[PDB]
Amino acid sequence: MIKSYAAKEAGGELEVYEYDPGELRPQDVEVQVDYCGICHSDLSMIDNEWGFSQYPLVAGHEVIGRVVALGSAAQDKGLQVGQRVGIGWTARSCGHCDACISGNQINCEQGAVPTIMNRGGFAEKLRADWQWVIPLPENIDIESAGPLLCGGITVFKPLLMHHITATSRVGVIGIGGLGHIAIKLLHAMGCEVTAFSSNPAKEQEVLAMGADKVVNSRDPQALKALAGQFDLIINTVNVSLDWQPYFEALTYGGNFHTVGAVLTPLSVPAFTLIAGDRSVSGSATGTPYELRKLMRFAARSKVAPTTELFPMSKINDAIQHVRDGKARYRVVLKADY
Amino acid sequence: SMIKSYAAKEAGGELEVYEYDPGELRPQDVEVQVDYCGICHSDLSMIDNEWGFSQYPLVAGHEVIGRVVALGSAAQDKGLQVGQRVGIGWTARSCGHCDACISGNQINCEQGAVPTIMNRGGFAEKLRADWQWVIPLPENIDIESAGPLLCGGITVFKPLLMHHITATSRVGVIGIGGLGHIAIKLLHAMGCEVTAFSSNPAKEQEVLAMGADKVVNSRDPQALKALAGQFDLIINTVNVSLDWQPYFEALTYGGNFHTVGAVLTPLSVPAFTLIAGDRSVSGSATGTPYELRKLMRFAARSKVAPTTELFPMSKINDAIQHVRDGKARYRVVLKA
Ligand SMILES: NC(=O)c1ccc[n+]([C@@H]2O[C@H](COP(=O)([O-])OP(=O)(O)OC[C@H]3O[C@@H](n4cnc5c(N)ncnc54)[C@H](OP(=O)(O)O)[C@@H]3O)[C@@H](O)[C@H]2O)c1
Ligand SMILES: NC(=O)c1ccc[n+]([C@@H]2O[C@H](COP(=O)([O-])OP(=O)(O)OC[C@H]3O[C@@H](n4cnc5c(N)ncnc54)[C@H](OP(=O)(O)O)[C@@H]3O)[C@@H](O)[C@H]2O)c1
Ligand SMILES: [Zn+2]
Ligand SMILES: [Zn+2]
Ligand SMILES: [Zn+2]
Ligand SMILES: [Zn+2]
């Protein structure tokens, strides 16, 4: 049995909960949790904000841990017992559809299985397919690496999709967990970087992360002044803002890319897309290769999430901390046991 | 419980019946019963040890259409079923877990992708390959001609992907043999402008009918001089060393010369030719499992089928000589 922290109903506090994982599947890897970040998606799933949560629910999906068991078909896949590894939002894919066999496992045509649906990292152990267990660079900071596995890849993927380079002008809306990692990554890439934030208390630290300037995200006149100045704007905000001034802040050929899980549909004038050949995009975390590459880049560039550590035994205080908007900038749980 | 095959016992030798024990089925392996197997010039090169890494006895053949007869213990939840019609190409094995493999670039496996031939190929009644290299086929594909698409087809398809060829591209093909005639057919289906460079005037009318806009003598440098700057891409399939400079000069600015032919004498590439016009010279090795899957679907939907001459597998030594003598029109296929 595995000891975890589970929600028994939508929006509930987490209780100690033990479950039987069954036998190790042939492709499975069992990982002993050392750290696990807390992601806004974890809150969304606990609260069933998206409509597919099943209870008891063991969330957590930003895991740094060590390999403790390898399935029968997972023995010569480059992993060894004791290896420090990461697990992100996704745990399973089929491996043989066109998407998987082309290196696009996140888009598995059978549906890639989220780690949380499989029982997640708010626990002492968890399991994933070996393809989704991410090897780590030797010198990576272990305490802060966890959020890179979801927050990091999620903002890294648009940089890949839209071919961002050092000459790009990139904005980031919402400097929380995902957003602040975005700022650090763009800085390491030499880009022009603008942070859009609703909290003046964050301004000085966000400038120190590498933002060239911080703009009030809730001021339409501030955005009006930036018309046509961005190649890419990444939205990480989960609430519905006035998006039109951000569309107009795009230069010709520019992209507005949302990774924030905005429930109210975006209102996208066809005339805004036509005049300037603009685009609106989304993406879901990333692929195993993109994760491997991100972790290596972050370690070599010394891009590390700004982290607040909590003991895993105080997970309910940690979760309320995030709900209350106090995460500076990502909360990470250290496993007790 | 052996596998009957046609093996070469020495470099350049004729093929003799040869039985071998494949061993236990590896967990990832798929055993395929051969229905057809193309003959590729790479088969001859391996038989003759032209490339210096052949091991004898050598069972060649790597353009296989067949049926799945057995699935290893880790190969049964991988979208394949016993009885399924499948293809196997030049490559049989890769590790699956290095960065190249897990990113969909299995042909570039960092442990070294294992050629089908090196672990016994398709000149046999059966062969085995990792499931990732077993290519599922579209329903309505012509199975008698499909075999060569698994190597000849993907090999000339890959530069079309690497160099982002579209219908407005101007593409030349040097050497209209097995690989080259498939490239002409593929380029025709894509709407490109297409020029064939050929050394054999007896092919000219057939190659025009395949879709070449014109056929130019591949051995006449003065004929290539008139086409200076007229091509975005030139694919070389020729295994011998030609006078390459006029082909480089036939590239427009930003154009690419791309060799899939296994030319032993190194290309002489003037830096000034690359600098003036921002040109490139490239190569590639067959392609990835996904690219193979996509190619088979495209070829079936577009009715791109290799022009094939069938031989019974028992007449394999006759078929090999037919290819050696330059008589293939345009790919020999062995029937099992
Ligand atoms: N697409 C994917 O694959 C993927 C992956 C992971 C997460 N997500 C989703 O991405 C979103 C952000 O995740 P996260 O972990 O970074 O959450 P987070 O730490 O709470 O960051 C959210 C940020 O958005 C801003 N924000 C929150 N409420 C706001 C409001 N009313 N008005 C203006 N700004 C507000 C705030 O930044 P400021 O203080 O700077 O204003 C806040 O820090 C979530 O919806 C998450 O579920 C998507
Ligand atoms: N890179 C890869 O991954 C890969 C994969 C498969 C094969 N290959 C290699 O590609 C090459 C072609 O294979 P293939 O099966 O298409 O061979 P093929 O059927 O023999 O075609 C070769 C063509 O090149 C021309 N040719 C031959 N000798 C010539 C000469 N002295 N001068 C001028 N042209 C000559 C001929 O075309 P014309 O009659 O029109 O002049 C001949 O038909 C081989 O070297 C093969 O090993 C590479
Ligand atoms: Zn997350
Ligand atoms: Zn899949
Ligand atoms: Zn071949
Ligand atoms: Zn590999």
Author numbering:
A (entry chain B): 3 to 339
B (entry chain A): 2 to 337
Copy text verbatim from the article accompanying this structure deposition:
Escherichia coli possess strong alcohol dehydrogenases that could contribute to producing alcohols through a designed pathway. These powerful enzymes, including YjgB, YahK, and YqhD, show nicotinamide adenine dinucleotide phosphate (NADP)-dependent activities for a variety of aldehydes. YqhD belongs to the family III metal-dependent polyol dehydrogenases, while YjgB and YahK are classified as members of the cinnamyl alcohol dehydrogenase family. As predicted from sequence alignment, the EcYjgB structure was found to belong to a typical cinnamyl alcohol dehydrogenase (CAD) family and sinapyl alcohol dehydrogenase (SAD) family, which consists of a nucleotide binding domain (NBD, residues 165–286) and a substrate-binding domain (SBD, residues 1–164 and 287–338). We observed a cleft between the SBD (substrate-binding domain) and NBD (nucleotide-binding domain) that forms the active site with a catalytic Zn2+ ion. It was found that the catalytic Zn2+ ion is coordinated by the tetrahedral combination of Cys41, His63, Glu64, and Cys152, which were well conserved.
The electron density of NADP is clearly shown in the NADP(H) binding site of the EcYjgB-NADP complex structure. We observed that His42, Ser43, Ser46, Gly179, Leu180, Ser199, Ser200, Asn201, Glu208, Ser285, Gly327, and Arg332 constitute the NADP(H) binding site. In addition, conserved Ser199 and Lys204 make it possible to specifically select the 2′ phosphate of NADP(H) as a stabilizing 2′ phosphate of the dinucleotide while using a hydrogen bond and charge-charge interaction. As it is holding the NADP, the SBD moves about 4.0 Å toward the NBD with a root-mean-square deviation (r.m.s.d.) of 1.02 Å when compared to the apo structure. It represents that NADP binding can generate the closed form, as observed in other CAD/SAD family. Meanwhile, each position of the four residues was 0.6 Å farther away from catalytic zinc in the EcYjgB-NADP complex, based on its superimposed structure with the apo form through the NBD region. During the determination of the structure comprising NADP, we found that a polyethylene glycol (PEG) fragment occupied its catalytic cavity, which was quite similar to a hexanaldehyde. Phe273′ turns toward the substrate binding site since PEG occupies the substrate-binding pocket after the conformational change upon NADP binding. Consequently, the oxygen from PEG nearby Phe273′ could form a kind of anion–π interaction that contributes to holding the ligand. Trp52 and Trp91 were shown to hold the ligand through CH-π stacking, which appeared to be a primary contributor for substrate recognition.
